[PDB]
Amino acid sequence: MENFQKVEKIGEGTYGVVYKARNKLTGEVVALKKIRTEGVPSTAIREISLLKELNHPNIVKLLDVIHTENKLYLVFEFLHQDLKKFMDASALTGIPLPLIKSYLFQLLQGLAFCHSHRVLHRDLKPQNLLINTEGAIKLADFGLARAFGVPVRTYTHEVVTLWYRAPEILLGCKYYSTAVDIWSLGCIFAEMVTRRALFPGDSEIDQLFRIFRTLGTPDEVVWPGVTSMPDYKPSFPKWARQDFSKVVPPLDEDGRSLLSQMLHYDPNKRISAKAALAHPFFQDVTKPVPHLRL
Numbered sequence: 001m002e003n004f005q006k007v008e009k010i011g012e013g014t015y016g017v018v019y020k021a022r023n024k025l026t027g028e029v030v031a032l033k034k035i036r037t038e039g040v041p042s043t044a045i046r047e048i049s050l051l052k053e054l055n056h057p058n059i060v061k062l063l064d065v066i067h068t069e070n071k072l073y074l075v076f077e078f079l080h081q082d083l084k085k086f087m088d089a090s091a092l093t094g095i096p097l098p099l100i101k102s103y104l105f106q107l108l109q110g111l112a113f114c115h116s117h118r119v120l121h122r123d124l125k126p127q128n129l130l131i132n133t134e135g136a137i138k139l140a141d142f143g144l145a146r147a148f149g150v151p152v153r154t155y156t157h158e159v160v161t162l163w164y165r166a167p168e169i170l171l172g173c174k175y176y177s178t179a180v181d182i183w184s185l186g187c188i189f190a191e192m193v194t195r196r197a198l199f200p201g202d203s204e205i206d207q208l209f210r211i212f213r214t215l216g217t218p219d220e221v222v223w224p225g226v227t228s229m230p231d232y233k234p235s236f237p238k239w240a241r242q243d244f245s246k247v248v249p250p251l252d253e254d255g256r257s258l259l260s261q262m263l264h265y266d267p268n269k270r271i272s273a274k275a276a277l278a279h280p281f282f283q284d285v286t287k288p289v290p291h292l293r294l
């Protein structure tokens, strides 16, 4: 990439290295992800390429996709901070409820949009939620492993975070639905509120059991079909569901009601992004200006 002038290496994404770069003709600053090997993912590459038309205020724009000599470069709209960093910076005081609500509402608008266009994210986490000084928050890095793939390592020795993984994925479901994104966003909502990850598992089974210890071990009553899932084991311990007021104190009942709907075990009972937008929790939603230190 000579049309680009690397500013600095930002980090090492889930597929490759990420650089901050400047386009030497437009002068625009962007985030450039370099991915990687014989096979040339023709379908994977095409999948990604269609995301260029997925344009919405709460989705980080995918400016270009360039396949050239054993490498795939994704050029993205640049934002200066992510939610993981903002949450860490706000840990002592906590993010104000009006800002939590604004961010949740905006993320639901973005998901409602992608889901309406049959696009799933599949790996939502604070680190891929980008924020700016105007109070906006945007979804980035749509995995779409549906025709690309999602390994247990980014690309070179890097532990995959399972904290936001929906239970159906952990139980081996082969077909992900839009509900997996709602589950992840529910986990993120809880984390913004309590300032601690909801289910910080360090292995797939520890992740699954942390979910069961809090929400109760699922059964055919609350999740028809759960006992026939690929990785379901009759030997799973049977934990009682914890009182929900214990999980995200001191969130009010409007917030708790919405969270409970985003965390239903049955993907078919889990609330959609479009329906969540209409939840009473958003009756007084506004768009505060966060104080960001860049």
Ligand SMILES: CCC(C)(C)[C@@H]1CCc2n[nH]c(C(=O)NCc3ccc(S(N)(=O)=O)cc3)c2C1
Binding pocket: 010, 013, 018, 020, 030, 031, 033, 060, 076, 077, 078, 079, 080, 081, 082, 083, 084, 085, 086, 127, 128, 129, 130, 140, 141
């Ligand atoms: C999520 C990774 C992906 C999918 C490649 C993102 C694709 C879209 C994107 N846009 N800007 C960035 C970006 O990286 N900015 C610089 C920056 C962001 C956060 C922080 S931080 N940890 O808040 O201090 C510091 C600098 C990315 C990365």
